[PDB]
């Protein structure tokens, strides 16, 4: 026999004691060690006094696997537990005082998510997704990384698109008091202006000029062309997004960017941030130059209020 602890969030343990005659499984359920699937395993020697991982199976463990997570998919323990037995074995290198990922299982597009997440403002609203940001700035990445797999329903290996990443993020994210007030002109069909809030107001897909967006972009309108443009916009960021093509990046004038060189899925992202001069960051990689010219498909912006003088 051992005791042991149970936990679902790893702040509230619960007191067991197991026989070691029978599988962790046969007594927790799906039981988890340090996201090994311990389930079809019996107690050993070493496993007394340690804390595991079990999905819930009464109130008390649903209710505090919610409050923690945010979510009451059932799978969901099992793919974050799935994802931290890699993320727990990759290497998580300072570049440029910014925590960064080296190269596994193509794994470039959550390296560049999370250079990203280090220069831009978002409170998380999980619980587990905020305690493992706070950590992940500090070096410690590994839990964060398994978590945005989890939460975006990716698995390890799986292309991943950074763009998308970031969004599913945002949805996770307090963006309430994040406003854009939009203006549409028709020539036939007059004037009109729509307001978006939340993560819809910090992203927009179509050019990464984030001028260009308050000059006005062409969109097609319900009579068959309108202009829409920035009339608002009250965020702390600005996403601006396109699909990749040749676009000179100039230092000071943007926080960060992602690169996207190759074929369409299966090609490999960098990460272009600007400090006193613009770096790129390749995973375990770094480089830098005053200028830049290449495919970029994601632009960051700082922003605070922005009232337009049309
Ligand atoms: C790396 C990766 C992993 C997965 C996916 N997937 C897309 C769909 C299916 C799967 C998952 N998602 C549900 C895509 C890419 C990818 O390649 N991302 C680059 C930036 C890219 C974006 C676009 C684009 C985006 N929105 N729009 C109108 C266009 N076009 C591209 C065209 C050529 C080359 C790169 C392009
Ligand atoms: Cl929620
Ligand atoms: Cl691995
Ligand atoms: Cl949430
Ligand atoms: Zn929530
Ligand atoms: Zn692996
Ligand atoms: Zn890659
Ligand atoms: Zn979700
Ligand atoms: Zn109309
Ligand atoms: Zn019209």
């Given at each position: 026999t051992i005791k042991v602890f149970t936990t679902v969030d790893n702040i509230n343990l619960h007191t067991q004691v197991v026989d070691?005659?029978?599988?962790y499984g046969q007594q927790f359920g799906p039981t988890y060690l340090d996201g090994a699937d311990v389930t079809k395993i019996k107690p050993h020697?070493?496993?007394?006094?340690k804390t595991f991982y079990v999905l819930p199976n009464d109130d008390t463990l649903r209710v505090e696997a919610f409050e923690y997570y945010?979510?009451?998919?059932?799978?969901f323990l099992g793919r974050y537990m799935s994802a931290l037995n890699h993320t727990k074995k990759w290497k998580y290198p300072q570049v440029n005082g910014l925590t960064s990922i080296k190269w596994a299982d193509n794994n470039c597009y959550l390296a560049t998510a999370l250079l990203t997440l280090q220069q831009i403002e978002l409170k998380f609203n999980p619980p587990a997704l905020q305690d493992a940001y706070y950590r992940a700035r500090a070096g410690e990445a590994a839990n964060f990384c398994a978590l945005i797999l989890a939460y975006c329903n990716k698995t390890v290996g799986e292309l991943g698109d950074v763009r998308e990443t970031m969004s599913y993020l945002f949805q996770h994210?307090?963006?309430?008091?994040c406003k854009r007030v939009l203006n549409v002109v028709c020539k036939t069909c007059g004037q009109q202006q729509t307001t978006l809030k939340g993560v819809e107001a910090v992203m927009y897909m179509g050019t990464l000029s984030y001028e260009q967006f308050k000059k006005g972009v062409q969109i097609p309108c319900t009579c068959g062309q309108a202009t829409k443009y920035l009339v608002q916009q009250e965020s702390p960021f600005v996403m601006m997004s396109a699909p990749p093509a040749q676009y000179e990046l100039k230092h000071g004038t943007f926080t960060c960017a992602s690169e996207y060189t190759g074929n369409y899925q299966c090609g490999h992202y960098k990460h272009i941030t600007s400090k006193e001069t613009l770096y790129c960051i390749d995973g375990a990689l770094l480089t830098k130059s005053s200028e830049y010219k290449g495919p970029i498909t994601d632009v960051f912006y700082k922003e605070n209020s922005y009232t337009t003088t049309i």
């Open positions: 070691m005659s029978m599988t020697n070493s496993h007394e006094g945010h979510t009451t998919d059932p799978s994210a307090n963006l309430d008091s």
